[PDB]
Amino acid sequence: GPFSLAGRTAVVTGAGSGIGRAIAHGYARAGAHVLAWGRTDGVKEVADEIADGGGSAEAVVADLADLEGAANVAEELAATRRVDVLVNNAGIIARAPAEEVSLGRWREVLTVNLDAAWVLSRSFGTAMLAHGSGRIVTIASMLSFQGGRNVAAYAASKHAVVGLTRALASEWAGRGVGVNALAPGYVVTANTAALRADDERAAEITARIPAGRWATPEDMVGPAVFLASDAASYVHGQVLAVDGGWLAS
Amino acid sequence: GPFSLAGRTAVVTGAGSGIGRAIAHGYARAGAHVLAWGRTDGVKEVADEIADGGGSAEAVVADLADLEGAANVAEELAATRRVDVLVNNAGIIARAPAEEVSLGRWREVLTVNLDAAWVLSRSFGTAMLAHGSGRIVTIASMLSFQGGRNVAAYAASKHAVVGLTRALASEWAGRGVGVNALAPGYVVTANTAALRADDERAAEITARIPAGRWATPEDMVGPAVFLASDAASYVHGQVLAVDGGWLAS
Amino acid sequence: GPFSLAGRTAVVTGAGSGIGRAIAHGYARAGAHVLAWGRTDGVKEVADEIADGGGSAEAVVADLADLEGAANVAEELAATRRVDVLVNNAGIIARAPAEEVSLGRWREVLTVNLDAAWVLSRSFGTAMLAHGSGRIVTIASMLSFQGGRNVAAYAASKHAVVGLTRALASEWAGRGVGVNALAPGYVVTANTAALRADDERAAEITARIPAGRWATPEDMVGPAVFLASDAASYVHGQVLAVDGGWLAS
Amino acid sequence: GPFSLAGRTAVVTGAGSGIGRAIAHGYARAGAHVLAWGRTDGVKEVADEIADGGGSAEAVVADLADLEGAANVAEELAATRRVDVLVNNAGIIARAPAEEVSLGRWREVLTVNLDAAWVLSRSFGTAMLAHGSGRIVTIASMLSFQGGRNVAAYAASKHAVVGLTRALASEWAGRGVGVNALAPGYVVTANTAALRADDERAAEITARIPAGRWATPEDMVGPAVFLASDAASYVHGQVLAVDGGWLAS
Ligand SMILES: NC(=O)c1ccc[n+]([C@@H]2O[C@H](COP(=O)([O-])OP(=O)(O)OC[C@H]3O[C@@H](n4cnc5c(N)ncnc54)[C@H](OP(=O)(O)O)[C@@H]3O)[C@@H](O)[C@H]2O)c1
Ligand SMILES: NC(=O)c1ccc[n+]([C@@H]2O[C@H](COP(=O)([O-])OP(=O)(O)OC[C@H]3O[C@@H](n4cnc5c(N)ncnc54)[C@H](OP(=O)(O)O)[C@@H]3O)[C@@H](O)[C@H]2O)c1
Ligand SMILES: NC(=O)c1ccc[n+]([C@@H]2O[C@H](COP(=O)([O-])OP(=O)(O)OC[C@H]3O[C@@H](n4cnc5c(N)ncnc54)[C@H](OP(=O)(O)O)[C@@H]3O)[C@@H](O)[C@H]2O)c1
Ligand SMILES: NC(=O)c1ccc[n+]([C@@H]2O[C@H](COP(=O)([O-])OP(=O)(O)OC[C@H]3O[C@@H](n4cnc5c(N)ncnc54)[C@H](OP(=O)(O)O)[C@@H]3O)[C@@H](O)[C@H]2O)c1
């Protein structure tokens, strides 16, 4: 089908839990061979889950905070395999008023959210250019469009990956590489645990989401498959928000 | 299926040619019963094509420039059927320097591009609210985001339908009606024949499109099906550009 | 100075009260001769206020709901005077759930908010093109970017004037006519009386505005003068939001 | 005066040439005491120009590529003065296809364009919060909104500073610190010399600019003064494009 990922090989970062894990499973169900990339061996679980369900997968363990090491691993893979799809999902958020953010903490967020996404995009994207086709989907955020509260480095980094998306689409679309972003709204995962623990804040958020409910990681799967599939072949340099109407509120 | 329209009934306006015709066909292939709505009997041919192609379709003939008439037809269809999906595709464009635009010509563009989309959205949308479920997809444009040249009324109308998309999503998402837009880039259709008449203007446009080619109507089908399907159930109030990277250039 | 409007003649619509009245006064203080355009004779008051303060002004009474009449008046003026600046401020908002909006009420909002702005822009803009310079500033809205609640026609119309702004800037910037928009956030005026009367809604809004306070009409003056002045001579087709940070929240 | 900077102290980075130099001068003319911050002693010349031009200015020499050093300098200046305005203008650009971009070159761009703006904003901003008042204006770019060509790191960095602008505005507006950005279009400066080296590339750009001309650094001054003045006191979290209509084309 036009929505099929049969015959593709997809790398999905931060595949150990949350949105990444759901996308890894979803891609496998869609027919892709999945490289689940994670920071710890716990991603081997996911690879096993996929296998035990009839799917095709394997684990990659490499800490994206280590850019040099990440680049080595990605280049190895890009050369060793025909990777058709990259999903830049790994990300971290640090909540603290701007005045209190140390340079170290600012850089830590930017390293994983932006720099690593760049390193992987460059590595796998360069091989995609050589094969005449590929897709790269980066997980963005509501904070790719808005400032939020107490997450300045996060907001900067999430705006940044949208710039990276547009730049790479501009340069690479004509050579068969489709680069886009998927911006989740408010999703029930570990990254929002502290947020949801604040009853008042969580109620404020919920009241504002037009759909009236937070997302599950599964809500991100349909759109992630779409963006990696033939069905999105003329879609380039876009950010598709999956946010229950948040950006319209 | 996550991307299936099996069991749905869809109304597609401007279904007689170009983008609407392609969407009508694609929706039928995805399992929808299609009500092909057009201004002339030409749309009966489309329903017939879909028919002996193995699909399910009927034709609706009604001039969207007649809003009172359009409302009557939409309301009756909404009351005698269960219409799950509406695609607002009918649109016209008038090219002329803004200084030369008569009020009548301004009005003619807004009536079809904006007012008619409103009347149909209100009519089918009201019934969707009662059924607890539905999707509305409006065909926007690059000129929903930029000014272009010699198309002031068109740009105004295409920004306006994005505003409408956002307003209805904000109001209706929480009641199960998913309202979104699809913004085509430059597409080979009767609507751009006058534009492409000038080979130099055409090539100038192509040079600017990152993908290096104009779209065909078929390029709009995958995204149109996605936005009407279960895979997009948390997508609300969004404008998905299908534009070969234009907006990123 | 670069921020001076000395020697200019400015038309300001909806100048009888609120944002328009404050802009009329502000422009006069900046040195412009002001044509205060209103729906009723109450705008003669404003013209008198300006005069009694040492400024230069006069009243224009013409109901913008009457497009034909508006066009006659604007064309008369455009030919009779050297109008350097037009501020399209007149506007109406009608709050009601979308399902309940009649076609008549939809059209009423679009007529004043969009059609009239177009008629005046075309009339005065055409004369500006002939004189080799001019500015047009249209009052937009937060609902030029977002859907809001219970104001679908308003949102459509306010998105639309942003399209009109971009289109006219695209066509006319090179011939000396600077066309831009000013998008107010939440302002204490008659148009928000019903909103502010709802204690809970008003508190919701206030909590969301980062600056922590609603705007006064006076908050719009500095930006309106800026956009009409030599200081903004390379600013074209932009929407400057004056919103206390609303769009960043 | 609504547009006066009389009695203010302003720090302008990259003040040695181009846009920064022009802003330094314009701020001085508007009555500000200017701290012209540059990487080399060249900026002492600027302070001297301002001086015998009748203005008030000092020079600060500090390489923004050295973030630990930049932080020390900014913190000391913030503690020993009352700095009312910060203009983050220092920026660099590196042109090269993304496939050819080394991690070091990527980092060099982000360090100056993003990280340094962060360090200074945090340093001066913290003191502004304590004084209950301040303005921060960051120089963004067209590539804060589009991908451009052969400038992936630059586009990422310029989107990022918009994210930062929005985050700080969201957090700080309610405490009297107005944080905004100014996005120049194509400007005749050393930063675009390599671009303009090719007369055909230059003319191609000009053809696309609605205003029909590239900007000069002086085109940025009026908007820069506006954003730092009382006239913009309700403007928060905004990016004002000064681009001859580029973004509308
Ligand atoms: N949840 C939301 O509402 C929301 C909204 C907007 C955007 N997003 C984005 O969506 C993405 C998915 O995250 P999530 O929501 O699903 O939260 P999550 O599952 O709880 O955590 C995200 C994943 O990133 C991984 N990761 C972090 N640093 C890594 C590193 N240096 N190397 C390799 N992997 C690393 C985590 O693995 P480890 O735990 O082992 O470190 C984890 O698997 C993130 O980029 C996030 O920013 C989420
Ligand atoms: N082509 C592009 O590059 C582009 C870009 C952005 C958006 N769009 C939009 O895509 C949509 C489809 O246009 P198209 O490109 O596919 O060209 P098209 O082949 O001419 O499609 C437009 C259709 O609208 C129908 N229509 C016009 N007025 C009508 C009315 N009063 N009542 C009922 N139907 C009416 C036309 O039917 P009749 O032939 O009988 O009049 C025609 O079938 C439009 O909204 C258009 O604005 C196109
Ligand atoms: N207040 C906000 O928060 C906000 C936010 C976004 C945008 N805006 C826009 O800012 C603009 C200013 O309005 P406002 O806030 O200052 O409210 P307002 O002063 O209470 O009312 C606006 C003005 O529009 C005039 N007007 C309406 N219809 C007219 C017509 N057919 N012909 C001539 N004049 C007409 C009104 O005059 P009459 O009363 O005599 O009819 C009135 O003077 C509006 O376009 C509004 O949409 C306001
Ligand atoms: N020109 C355009 O079309 C355009 C468009 C959008 C944005 N911008 C932005 O406008 C700003 C100004 O650039 P410009 O156009 O005026 O060209 P410019 O004349 O080269 O200005 C850039 C300045 O940044 C300074 N700088 C670079 N690295 C520095 C460092 N590590 N520490 C301290 N200062 C440093 C440079 O000083 P040195 O000479 O000593 O290195 C230079 O004076 C930049 O942010 C730029 O990205 C320009």
Short mmCIF file of N, CA and C in Angstrom, two decimals, chain C residues 7 37-38 41 44 65 76 108 116 129 133 142 164 174-175 178 182 213 216 222 225 233 249:
data_model
loop_
_atom_site.label_atom_id
_atom_site.label_comp_id
_atom_site.label_asym_id
_atom_site.label_seq_id
_atom_site.Cartn_x
_atom_site.Cartn_y
_atom_site.Cartn_z
N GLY C 7 3.46 66.34 8.15
CA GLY C 7 3.25 66.49 6.72
C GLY C 7 2.47 65.37 6.06
N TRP C 37 -12.56 58.48 10.46
CA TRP C 37 -13.67 57.87 9.73
C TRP C 37 -14.48 57.00 10.69
N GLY C 38 -15.77 57.27 10.79
CA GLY C 38 -16.62 56.51 11.69
C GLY C 38 -17.99 56.19 11.11
N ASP C 41 -21.98 60.13 13.71
CA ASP C 41 -21.52 61.50 13.91
C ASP C 41 -20.66 61.66 15.17
N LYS C 44 -17.27 62.98 15.01
CA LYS C 44 -17.06 64.42 14.98
C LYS C 44 -16.50 64.89 16.33
N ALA C 65 -20.40 48.96 6.34
CA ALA C 65 -21.24 47.85 5.93
C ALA C 65 -21.80 48.11 4.54
N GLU C 76 -13.57 59.47 -3.59
CA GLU C 76 -13.67 60.91 -3.49
C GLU C 76 -12.46 61.46 -2.74
N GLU C 108 -22.14 39.46 7.55
CA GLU C 108 -22.05 40.76 8.21
C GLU C 108 -20.64 40.99 8.76
N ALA C 116 -14.60 45.63 3.49
CA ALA C 116 -14.43 47.08 3.60
C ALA C 116 -12.95 47.44 3.65
N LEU C 129 -0.05 54.57 -4.98
CA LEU C 129 0.81 54.10 -6.06
C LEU C 129 1.12 55.27 -7.02
N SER C 133 4.31 56.73 -2.96
CA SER C 133 4.53 56.38 -1.57
C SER C 133 3.23 56.36 -0.77
N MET C 142 -5.26 38.43 17.53
CA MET C 142 -4.77 37.12 17.96
C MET C 142 -5.46 36.06 17.10
N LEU C 164 -4.57 39.49 2.84
CA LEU C 164 -4.66 40.70 2.05
C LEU C 164 -3.41 41.55 2.25
N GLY C 174 7.36 47.43 -4.06
CA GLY C 174 8.35 47.96 -4.99
C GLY C 174 7.98 49.30 -5.61
N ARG C 175 6.75 49.74 -5.37
CA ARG C 175 6.25 51.01 -5.90
C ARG C 175 5.96 52.01 -4.79
N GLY C 178 3.96 50.80 1.59
CA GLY C 178 4.27 49.85 2.64
C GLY C 178 3.01 49.34 3.34
N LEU C 182 -1.16 45.27 12.29
CA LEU C 182 -0.89 45.36 13.71
C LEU C 182 -1.92 44.46 14.38
N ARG C 213 -1.13 41.71 32.29
CA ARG C 213 -2.18 42.73 32.24
C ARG C 213 -2.75 42.81 30.83
N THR C 216 -4.36 48.57 27.04
CA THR C 216 -5.25 49.71 26.83
C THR C 216 -5.16 50.09 25.36
N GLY C 222 1.99 53.57 19.87
CA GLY C 222 3.39 53.53 19.52
C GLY C 222 3.61 52.64 18.31
N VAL C 225 2.12 54.19 15.05
CA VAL C 225 2.95 55.29 14.54
C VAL C 225 4.21 54.75 13.89
N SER C 233 10.55 51.90 7.03
CA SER C 233 10.51 51.98 5.57
C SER C 233 10.88 50.66 4.85
N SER C 249 2.72 32.37 24.58
CA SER C 249 2.25 31.59 25.71
C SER C 249 1.65 30.25 25.26
#
